[PDB]
Design a protein around this ligand. Sequence first.
Ligand SMILES: *[C@@H]1O[C@H](CO)[C@@H](O[C@@H]2O[C@H](CO)[C@@H](O[C@@H]3O[C@H](CO)[C@@H](O)[C@H](O[C@H]4O[C@H](CO)[C@@H](O)[C@H](O)[C@@H]4O[C@H]4O[C@H](CO)[C@@H](O)[C@H](O)[C@@H]4O[C@H]4O[C@H](CO)[C@@H](O)[C@H](O)[C@@H]4O)[C@@H]3O)[C@H](O)[C@H]2NC(C)=O)[C@H](O)[C@H]1NC(C)=O
Ligand SMILES: *[C@@H]1O[C@H](CO)[C@@H](O[C@@H]2O[C@H](CO)[C@@H](O[C@@H]3O[C@H](CO)[C@@H](O)[C@H](O[C@H]4O[C@H](CO)[C@@H](O)[C@H](O)[C@@H]4O[C@H]4O[C@H](CO)[C@@H](O)[C@H](O)[C@@H]4O[C@H]4O[C@H](CO)[C@@H](O)[C@H](O)[C@@H]4O)[C@@H]3O)[C@H](O)[C@H]2NC(C)=O)[C@H](O)[C@H]1NC(C)=O
Ligand SMILES: *[C@@H]1O[C@H](CO)[C@@H](O[C@@H]2O[C@H](CO)[C@@H](O[C@@H]3O[C@H](CO)[C@@H](O)[C@H](O[C@H]4O[C@H](CO)[C@@H](O)[C@H](O)[C@@H]4O[C@H]4O[C@H](CO)[C@@H](O)[C@H](O)[C@@H]4O[C@H]4O[C@H](CO)[C@@H](O)[C@H](O)[C@@H]4O)[C@@H]3O)[C@H](O)[C@H]2NC(C)=O)[C@H](O)[C@H]1NC(C)=O
Ligand SMILES: *[C@@H]1O[C@H](CO)[C@@H](O)[C@H](O)[C@H]1NC(C)=O
Ligand SMILES: *[C@@H]1O[C@H](CO)[C@@H](O)[C@H](O)[C@H]1NC(C)=O
Ligand SMILES: *[C@@H]1O[C@H](CO)[C@@H](O)[C@H](O)[C@H]1NC(C)=O
Ligand SMILES: *[C@@H]1O[C@H](CO)[C@@H](O)[C@H](O)[C@H]1NC(C)=O
Ligand SMILES: *[C@@H]1O[C@H](CO)[C@@H](O)[C@H](O)[C@H]1NC(C)=O
Ligand SMILES: *[C@@H]1O[C@H](CO)[C@@H](O)[C@H](O)[C@H]1NC(C)=O
Ligand SMILES: [Ca+2]
Ligand SMILES: [Ca+2]
Ligand SMILES: [Ca+2]
Lengths: 107, 389, 389, 389
Amino acid sequence: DIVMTQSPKFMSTSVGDRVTITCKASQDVSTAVVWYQQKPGQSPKLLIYWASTRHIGVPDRFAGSGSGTDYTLTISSVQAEDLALYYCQQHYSPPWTFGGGTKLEIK
Amino acid sequence: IRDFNNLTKGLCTINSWHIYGKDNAVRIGEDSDVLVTREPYVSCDPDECRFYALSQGTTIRGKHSNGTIHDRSQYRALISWPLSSPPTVYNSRVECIGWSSTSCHDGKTRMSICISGPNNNASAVIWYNRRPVTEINTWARNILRTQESECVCHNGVCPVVFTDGSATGPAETRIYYFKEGKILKWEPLAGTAKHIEECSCYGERAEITCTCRDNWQGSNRPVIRIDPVAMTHTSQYICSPVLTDNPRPNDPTVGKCNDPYPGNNNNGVKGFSYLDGVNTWLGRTISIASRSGYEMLKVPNALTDDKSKPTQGQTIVLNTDWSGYSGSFMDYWAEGECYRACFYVELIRGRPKEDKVWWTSNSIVSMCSSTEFLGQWDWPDGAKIEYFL
Amino acid sequence: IRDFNNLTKGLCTINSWHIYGKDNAVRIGEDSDVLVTREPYVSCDPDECRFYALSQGTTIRGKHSNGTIHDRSQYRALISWPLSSPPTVYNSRVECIGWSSTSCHDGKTRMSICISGPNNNASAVIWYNRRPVTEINTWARNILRTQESECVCHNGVCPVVFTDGSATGPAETRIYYFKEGKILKWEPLAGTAKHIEECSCYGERAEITCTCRDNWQGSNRPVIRIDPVAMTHTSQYICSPVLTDNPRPNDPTVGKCNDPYPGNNNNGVKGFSYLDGVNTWLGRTISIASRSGYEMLKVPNALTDDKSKPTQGQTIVLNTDWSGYSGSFMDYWAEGECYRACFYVELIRGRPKEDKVWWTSNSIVSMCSSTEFLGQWDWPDGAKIEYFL
Amino acid sequence: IRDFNNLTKGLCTINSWHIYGKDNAVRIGEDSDVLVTREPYVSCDPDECRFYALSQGTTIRGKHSNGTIHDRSQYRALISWPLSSPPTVYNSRVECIGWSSTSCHDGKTRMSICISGPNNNASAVIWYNRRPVTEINTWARNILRTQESECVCHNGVCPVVFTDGSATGPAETRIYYFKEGKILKWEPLAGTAKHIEECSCYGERAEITCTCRDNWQGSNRPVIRIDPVAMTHTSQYICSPVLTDNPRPNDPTVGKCNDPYPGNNNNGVKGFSYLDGVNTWLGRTISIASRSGYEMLKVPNALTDDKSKPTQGQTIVLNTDWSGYSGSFMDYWAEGECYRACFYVELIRGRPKEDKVWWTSNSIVSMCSSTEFLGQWDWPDGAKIEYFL
Ligand SMILES: *[C@@H]1O[C@H](CO)[C@@H](O[C@@H]2O[C@H](CO)[C@@H](O[C@@H]3O[C@H](CO)[C@@H](O)[C@H](O[C@H]4O[C@H](CO)[C@@H](O)[C@H](O)[C@@H]4O[C@H]4O[C@H](CO)[C@@H](O)[C@H](O)[C@@H]4O[C@H]4O[C@H](CO)[C@@H](O)[C@H](O)[C@@H]4O)[C@@H]3O)[C@H](O)[C@H]2NC(C)=O)[C@H](O)[C@H]1NC(C)=O
Ligand SMILES: *[C@@H]1O[C@H](CO)[C@@H](O[C@@H]2O[C@H](CO)[C@@H](O[C@@H]3O[C@H](CO)[C@@H](O)[C@H](O[C@H]4O[C@H](CO)[C@@H](O)[C@H](O)[C@@H]4O[C@H]4O[C@H](CO)[C@@H](O)[C@H](O)[C@@H]4O[C@H]4O[C@H](CO)[C@@H](O)[C@H](O)[C@@H]4O)[C@@H]3O)[C@H](O)[C@H]2NC(C)=O)[C@H](O)[C@H]1NC(C)=O
Ligand SMILES: *[C@@H]1O[C@H](CO)[C@@H](O[C@@H]2O[C@H](CO)[C@@H](O[C@@H]3O[C@H](CO)[C@@H](O)[C@H](O[C@H]4O[C@H](CO)[C@@H](O)[C@H](O)[C@@H]4O[C@H]4O[C@H](CO)[C@@H](O)[C@H](O)[C@@H]4O[C@H]4O[C@H](CO)[C@@H](O)[C@H](O)[C@@H]4O)[C@@H]3O)[C@H](O)[C@H]2NC(C)=O)[C@H](O)[C@H]1NC(C)=O
Ligand SMILES: *[C@@H]1O[C@H](CO)[C@@H](O)[C@H](O)[C@H]1NC(C)=O
Ligand SMILES: *[C@@H]1O[C@H](CO)[C@@H](O)[C@H](O)[C@H]1NC(C)=O
Ligand SMILES: *[C@@H]1O[C@H](CO)[C@@H](O)[C@H](O)[C@H]1NC(C)=O
Ligand SMILES: *[C@@H]1O[C@H](CO)[C@@H](O)[C@H](O)[C@H]1NC(C)=O
Ligand SMILES: *[C@@H]1O[C@H](CO)[C@@H](O)[C@H](O)[C@H]1NC(C)=O
Ligand SMILES: *[C@@H]1O[C@H](CO)[C@@H](O)[C@H](O)[C@H]1NC(C)=O
Ligand SMILES: [Ca+2]
Ligand SMILES: [Ca+2]
Ligand SMILES: [Ca+2]
């Protein structure tokens, strides 16, 4: 199916800077990428769909970009409370396939 | 009728919608010879209303339906078949060859325009009265496209909106004013609209209103209002926070009358609206990310008010079912004090969300206004992707 | 119209061609009931243009399509179906029974001629107004044949070219002048033309021009120009070095106006040309040895100049795709200052180059002139011989 | 036309026959939806000639075609479809329900008669102008039957021959004279004819001539000549030794004008003849024991001479191919000095000689006269009973 691939898997940035998570698909996914964020010990929250459209109330510092098979999620002014697992997910054809997550550690 | 049509009435009050036509194309085409189509619409002669759509040159069941996700090829043609029959190999009629069209009846006979060719050398030839009258070559060399719903005429003049150039940027939109298949005049897009795609139009009281698609930055829709008598136009966006393109950001509280509403970029769906003061209804997908479901909401003064919110509504396809392109048409030769607003929804089926099959195809639901407040039902395409396996 | 047609206009300027009609017969006939045909053409009534072809009495998919490489049998018939529908069992109309035809509308109704029989006792019966009026028995006992494209009429007189006798030699060609399905007069071929087969004709300004096939020694095509008013004709060959039969030798630098151009012997393909001074366009296969590809070249004064070379051109079917028979037709009852030149290409499919299947059949592409210079695309039959296995 | 037809002309000279229509029903019906029929015929309106036949309520390929050897059931109906189309489920039109029919156009509209019911309580209802006008119950309680080819009218009067009673004996034949679907008068068979079955009729110069079938002792055919103006008739047999029923004894040298020619007993086939002095042609199977082949022989004065032998002839179906029912029709509304004699042959296929399949069905060949002497071909149904296995 479309196989979503995330690497790196652990990332660190200090408070205030940018980090940019990379996610990649196995075939043209035609800008159908969703990004969830799963805060440690909580449920996933939908951050961005169609690669850039932020959902109701996810702050502008979170910005999605991407095209073809390459997508990337950026967070600016990393907050201490931004520590979490970030998953990308294709939403172009069933089954919906998620990337393996990337952990954000705050340096 | 044997005389040109003049848009002398205004809309009728829209207080709910009633079913006008239903295809059932894909459910019947599982055993009969139905053609794979896409980009449907409906258009009325003085004499009859007929369903219109772009065909793909194969039947759903034949092996050549593999690959019909593709938009334009040289086996697409604009066909016509009777209201609520499926588009059969045996009862369809080809109006022209091409992969983008518009067609309308001026009162005496009808204009049909098909566009064709490679993306860098496309042509439009305008058929008037089942004979080719005029042709127009490409002007910006990048997929010359047009309406995908009917054009509207007033005293022989039928404005037609074409776009040539990027879908991800500035493109070259022009309004052409044909009469008897000849070009009277044409002009560039003028107004605050940033990009134009697949306009859905209707006319009343000597003015033609088109609701279109901003594929480059809008989630609110551009409106073009054309004066067929002076042959001029203006463009703006629907002021309402009830955002109606798809995909879209979540509806705000204040909209944007002169600019694209920001959020989804480089995407869209064809859609329509009856914009008539308090009598305004808007159509939109129920889903924000996909072509599923379809509702009609009454949002009074949506065109001009940046705080317009719905006050009545109607569900046409449930969000658990697929929808697709929508557009407007009216029976201008219907008897009576006003015009009955009608619309159609394209119900897309197949690739890419239902990839278990290799075709993309669709069926039609159309509704028309009533002044009664009628009960609502929903209207699913209806086929089971599992019986085609 | 209710009055005889008179060819009172001249051609329009041909500055590129635009698609008029496309069948998609073989791609649709993989799942629907399309009839196996061959030798197509198009012809217009005052009222409608319809596709015309010789049928073989079986559908592509039925087991009886095995063997349709064969040209003439008693299950062939000349049928008619609406412009750009496939020739379906259910929407076709038989004009007569036979294996060679010509048909044309004189303005009041139409003439259709089918030829039939054993190769040594063939007959032609001329149908006027869907009733059999006159018949003609064979005169040289060896496959009486005729046009395979429409005849052209002027004030009720419709010249029709027939050949009876060898295809590998001298044969007996006669020009017949019918009116209301009766024989007014007939004459033997007169001119410098050595052999005549399958003429493609059009008329303008009271003169009928036929471009034909020299099956016995030509690679350049015989032209017959007929005067329907005095009922006389002359024949010559196209002077141009742009050789247009197929198969053909490689184009020379000086052609031959009064003789066959030497090289391929005992073979050919039906083909057409609009011969109008500087406004001259010629059609030909792109391949020299086979029916693949099809281009239209502007070769000014090709008829009279033995050094005429192309000055503009247009690719209609790529050389990587199959073409076949071509011929001319015009909508004489189209409104306007001049006549729009049109043509069709037969796209043959099946045996013998694609022998994996046991049928031979074909589909249609037709184009008509424009004065704009329009972008070109190519137009493949489109089916995959592998889905019929 | 809008006025009653009057048979004001005589026959044209018959000097050979030319093909008028060919079906190819069974070869096309191997892949398309053709209906199983039997007992075909052809009949002309002022407007069009159409093929007519008795249908069996199933398509050749569907499983319900098993058992259609059977003549009469309540799923048979008299249908109509355009000249030379196959009798398709989709282009056929039912004129009435029943298992024996006759139909004809009086000039203003048409009469169609279907007979139905159990063999001991059969009814005929006469449809005039697609509405049921009159009905007639059985009179001898044993399979009321009628023509199986068209009736002929003169000034509104259309004589129709019915037989009720044994097919192996004396039966009750009556000539009915309808006008506008009402019974003007009727009379019993009068003449020297011993039994009457399935008359084939034509009219010229105000007299209607029917050639029929003696199922009980004849091998020569009964002739009934009717005067539609005085509404009287006489019957006799064809005097000629060229015996034309089937099966038949070998042709003698002296025939029998007033009696059955003795030899085969209790069998026959429907057949026709144009009886016009020296201009007389007779049709017959080539085989003496079976429905195979079909030839037309010129036998001058066959009606009156008991030594008439053929002087010219024409082979229509080879003896190595199947034939079947034949009958006459003429286009009475064809323009010109005389009437063109036409006929059809039913080409039966299936059970019982080709029992490998379980259906019986048929196709049509029709020919019409010419004054030219045209070359002859033969005309096979054409299907291979082996592709249906
Ligand atoms: C017999 O039939 C009659 C006639 O049909 C039935 O009566 C009708 O029943 C309808 C359903 O109850 C009713 O429609 C509703 O009317 C209200 C007005 O009071 C209108 O606001 C409703 O529209 C909103 O809600 C629907 C779902 O209920 C949404 O799909 C729609 O988009 C509207 O909500 C969204 O947009 C609004 C404007 O921005 C927001 O305020 C709202 O938060 C919401 O936003 C989210 O969703 C969007 C996508 O869904 C998304 O883009 C956005 O970003 C947010 O996430 C609705 O139209 C009819 O008015 C009523 N008609 C009559 C004549 O009474 C009756 O039920 C039937 N009877 C029986 C017994 O079955
Ligand atoms: C947008 O669309 C427009 C409009 O279509 C495009 O512009 C057009 O582009 C055409 C292709 O470039 C162009 O056609 C050419 O015009 C020239 C005149 O300058 C003409 O000579 C060309 O014809 C020869 O070449 C073609 C292939 O290019 C051959 O197939 C053809 O047979 C001609 O060559 C043969 O015959 C000649 C005469 O004897 C010989 O001189 C020549 O050697 C050659 O002979 C061999 O080949 C024969 C078989 O192929 C064989 O029998 C013989 O024996 C030899 O072996 C060609 O028509 C249009 O004029 C041009 N039109 C316009 C309005 O500009 C444009 O490209 C598109 N734009 C984009 C961006 O895609
Ligand atoms: C180009 O086309 C033209 C036009 O078609 C061709 O010319 C035509 O060619 C026909 C065939 O040669 C020719 O027909 C014959 O005409 C003669 C008159 O001279 C006529 O007698 C012939 O009919 C008898 O023979 C045929 C077979 O040849 C039989 O099937 C038929 O029944 C006739 O014979 C039987 O009945 C006769 C009368 O009783 C008996 O005398 C005879 O013995 C025989 O009886 C037996 O057979 C019966 C069943 O078959 C059975 O019931 C009986 O008991 C006995 O057993 C035949 O019609 C055309 O006249 C001629 N026309 C023209 C205009 O010339 C030409 O060939 C073609 N050219 C080329 C180059 O191919
Ligand atoms: C149509 O409307 C124009 C003005 O919009 C008017 O001048 C013309 O006469 C009208 N014609 C008809 C037939 O209504
Ligand atoms: C069409 O469908 C087949 C399977 O039905 C698939 O394997 C193939 O790649 C598809 N595309 C084409 C051009 O055949
Ligand atoms: C047609 O043309 C002939 C001369 O070519 C002329 O005499 C005749 O009157 C014309 N008739 C019509 C109806 O144009
Ligand atoms: C028809 O096709 C078959 C295979 O489908 C072939 O073997 C046979 O010879 C062909 N010809 C005839 C008359 O069957
Ligand atoms: C038809 O014929 C009858 C006599 O047979 C005659 O009296 C009658 O007036 C004729 N009518 C027409 C319209 O020919
Ligand atoms: C019909 O055909 C089948 C075989 O196809 C045969 O065995 C059966 O007896 C026939 N009759 C009926 C009524 O089924
Ligand atoms: Ca948009
Ligand atoms: Ca040649
Ligand atoms: Ca008998």
